[PDB]
């Protein structure tokens, strides 16, 4: 019966809560209180990449840390050479409402999608030198919110239909489908080894998925509202989530529990994007007040602020070598900080 | 300096030239509209009327006085809209179509409109309100089988506005009911409007051919008021 099953679910939730309470022998804050802070972090706008006509919704760094793909809701993908500010490509999208973009680790392809429910793959190295739509992955019944390449052939996408999916670009079919989220999945983050990935969704829940087995291994809760952003710790054993309740939180996969919370009483706007520095000591988060707070990931102290965006900060990424931070915004400008 | 650097700069210049070409046509000379409505609404008929001028989003392109309008209708999306509706924070106007003849869902339509109006990211977007299904509303009012005041008790006290211009053949009851619905929407419109955006009600039907001209005129008025406010003339 339904009542018996829900009572069993309540009992199991109590079991899990008690089990993870037994593991809370200490807190990261009181373990890190003895180490000196990083200090007052300062970053200046080295480059300001302009050329987009409308709000930028997403950006991604190439593995070389030079090239940079950004998606704007004017219907354009632009590949930037961040060193020289020169444009490398300008791909006209078939749908204006792009909500995400990705750069292949090899750099041969870029992907993007949005309200059209389709992930389009663009071949950047066509023999004729013109970008062509290599594939158009369809099957999701809701807007695409995130997408990340595992390699030149596989891509993982999260959609507003509450499901994530693993695709084979060559065949264009959904190799695996990930279900369990109750609301829209808003962000996605592959682990460094790409054996695992975490997805943040509405319902204030984050889940850990194993791509080969295709099932949810752990569910992380603690946020009070929608989770808009998620990023893996460089170690790969933890991740940080930004939420609409104006709070970031750090979770450890093995502890199966929230470690630290990054919030201040004077901050009440939601968080749109989060990222870690190369060492993982700094947690950079974008906010709806078009600022970015640099958080001491171990101390939960605001190490600094990145200001200069006129409108909402929507995307935020750190290079693979950790040399610079790129932040996009609804004012249509990208800025490289260092 | 080098040949490769010069080639890269030249390619960037060509890209910038194409971007300059794009920034005028289909970027700045065209106006984007978001079309909203419920299942019972007739927004499909609105799209069909505007046309003469397996998932995702639907776009309709039409022209009035050589001005280019792109009207977007969401297709295969879930029932939760607090996330994907942020994408339309810069459209010139929102077309909101309502089934005025369905009393049972008028409150649902009103809550939809109120949420749209009071959203933080739609805080500057004017709403063009189409009170669709006027003929059905007239038939329902004339029949008298459905007691409209049972859904909205205030209707038992509401009196038709003095400036309410009726149709030549409109029954007084039809005028009272339609204007009561319009004022129910306008109360929400005005109770929270800081002058940054406005609501433009229209009575429409499935056979009506003036909807494109209505949208053109309302977008003109919206942008005119925006410019007047910008220059401290309003």
């Amino acid at each position: 019966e339904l009542d018996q099953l829900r009572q069993e679910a309540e009992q199991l939730k109590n079991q899990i809560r008690d089990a993870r309470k037994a593991c809370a022998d200490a807190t990261l804050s009181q373990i890190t209180n003895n180490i000196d802070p990083v200090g007052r972090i300062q970053m200046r706008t080295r480059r300001t990449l302009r050329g987009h006509l409308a709000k930028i919704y997403a950006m991604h760094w190439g593995t070389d840390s030079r090239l940079l793909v950004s998606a704007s809701q004017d219907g354009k993908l632009i590949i930037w050479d961040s060193y020289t500010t020169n444009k490398v490509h300008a791909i006209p999208l078939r749908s204006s409402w792009v909500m995400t973009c990705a750069y292949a680790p090899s750099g041969n392809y870029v992907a993007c999608g949005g309200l059209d429910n389709i992930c389009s793959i663009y071949n950047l190295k066509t023999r004729e030198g013109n970008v062509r739509v290599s594939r158009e992955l369809a099957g999701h019944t809701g807007y695409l919110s995130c997408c990340r390449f595992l390699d030149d052939n596989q891509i993982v996408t999260s959609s507003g239909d509450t499901t994530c999916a693993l695709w084979d670009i060559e065949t264009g079919q959904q190799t695996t489908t990930f279900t369990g989220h109750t609301g829209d999945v808003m962000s996605l983050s592959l682990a460094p080894d790409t054996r695992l990935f975490v997805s943040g969704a509405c319902d204030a829940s984050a889940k850990l998925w194993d791509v080969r087995e295709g099932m949810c291994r752990q569910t992380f809760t603690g946020h009070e509202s929608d989770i808009n952003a998620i990023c893996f710790f460089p170690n790969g054993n933890a991740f940080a989530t930004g939420s609409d309740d104006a709070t970031c939180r750090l979770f450890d996969l093995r502890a199966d529990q929230e470690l630290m919370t990054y919030s201040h009483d004077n901050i009440i706007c939601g968080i749109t994007s989060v990222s870690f520095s190369k060492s993982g000591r700094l947690l950079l988060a974008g906010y709806d007040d078009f600022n970015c707070n640099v958080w001491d990931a171990l101390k939960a102290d605001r190490a600094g602020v990145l200001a200069g965006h006129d409108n909402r900060v929507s995307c935020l990424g750190v290079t693979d070598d950790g040399m610079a931070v790129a932040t996009g915004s609804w004012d249509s400008f990208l800025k490289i900080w260092n | 300096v080098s040949a490769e650097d010069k080639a890269a700069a030249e390619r960037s210049k060509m890209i910038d030239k194409n971007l300059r070409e794009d920034g005028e046509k289909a970027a700045a000379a065209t106006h984007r509209l978001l079309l909203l409505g419920a299942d019972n609404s007739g927004k499909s008929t609105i799209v069909k009327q505007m046309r003469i001028y397996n998932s995702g989003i639907f776009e309709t392109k039409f022209q009035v006085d050589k001005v280019n309008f792109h009207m977007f209708d969401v297709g295969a999306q879930r029932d939760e809209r607090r996330k994907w509706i942020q994408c339309f924070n810069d459209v010139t106007a929102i077309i909101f179509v309502v089934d005025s003849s369905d009393y049972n869902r008028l409150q649902e339509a009103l809550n939809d409109f109120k949420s749209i109006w009071n959203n933080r990211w739609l805080r500057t977007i004017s709403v063009i309100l189409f009170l669709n299904k006027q003929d059905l509303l007239a038939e329902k009012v004339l029949a008298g089988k459905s007691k409209i005041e049972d859904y909205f008790p205030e209707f038992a006290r509401y009196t038709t506005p003095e400036d309410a211009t009726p149709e030549p053949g409109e029954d007084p009851r039809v005028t009272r009911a339609k204007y009561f619905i319009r004022d129910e929407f306008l109360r929400i419109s005005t109770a929270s409007g800081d002058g940054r955006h406005y609501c433009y009600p229209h009575f429409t039907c499935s056979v009506d051919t003036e909807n494109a001209r209505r949208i053109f005129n309302d977008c003109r008025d919206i942008i005119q008021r925006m410019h007047l406010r910008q220059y401290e003339l309003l």
Partner: nanobody, 127 residues
Framework: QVQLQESGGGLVQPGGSLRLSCAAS????????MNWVRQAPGKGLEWVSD????????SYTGSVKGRFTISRDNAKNTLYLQMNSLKPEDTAVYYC?????????????????????RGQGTQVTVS
């Protein structure tokens, strides 16, 4: 973990009274609007009432004005719906819906089919 637990309900004669209560936990109860929604048999979810963060501004659906009155107790993190003059058409499952985001004035998806921040629901029947 955000969870909302309604209480109260059961059979009642027409013209009777009920006091529906919701105990909320896992979030700052005072930062959000709170709503009451109901789903009569064979019908979709219907928004019944609403109340602001501090209780200053409240609203009701037309068929409910004058009969129900919504109340909020931020100290106790409890939401109430005093239901007077009940009628047979009030027979429905009553859910308490949390506003999706704090400090916001809009409540977009409270009445959706699978809204995440809704309660489990309590059944109310009027003879």
């Amino acid at each position: 973990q955000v969870q909302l637990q309604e209480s109260g309900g059961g059979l009642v004669q027409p013209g009777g009274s009920l006091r529906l209560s919701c105990a909320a936990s896992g979030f700052t109860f005072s930062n959000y609007k709170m709503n009451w929604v109901r789903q009569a048999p064979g019908k979709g979810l219907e928004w019944v009432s609403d109340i602001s963060q501090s209780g200053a501004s409240i609203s009701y659906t037309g068929s409910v004005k004058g009969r129900f009155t919504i109340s909020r107790d931020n100290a106790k993190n409890t939401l109430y719906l005093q239901m007077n003059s009940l009628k047979p058409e009030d027979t429905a499952v009553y859910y308490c819906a949390r506003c999706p985001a704090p400090f916001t004035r809009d409540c977009f998806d409270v009445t959706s089919t699978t809204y995440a921040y809704r309660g489990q629901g309590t059944q109310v029947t009027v003879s």
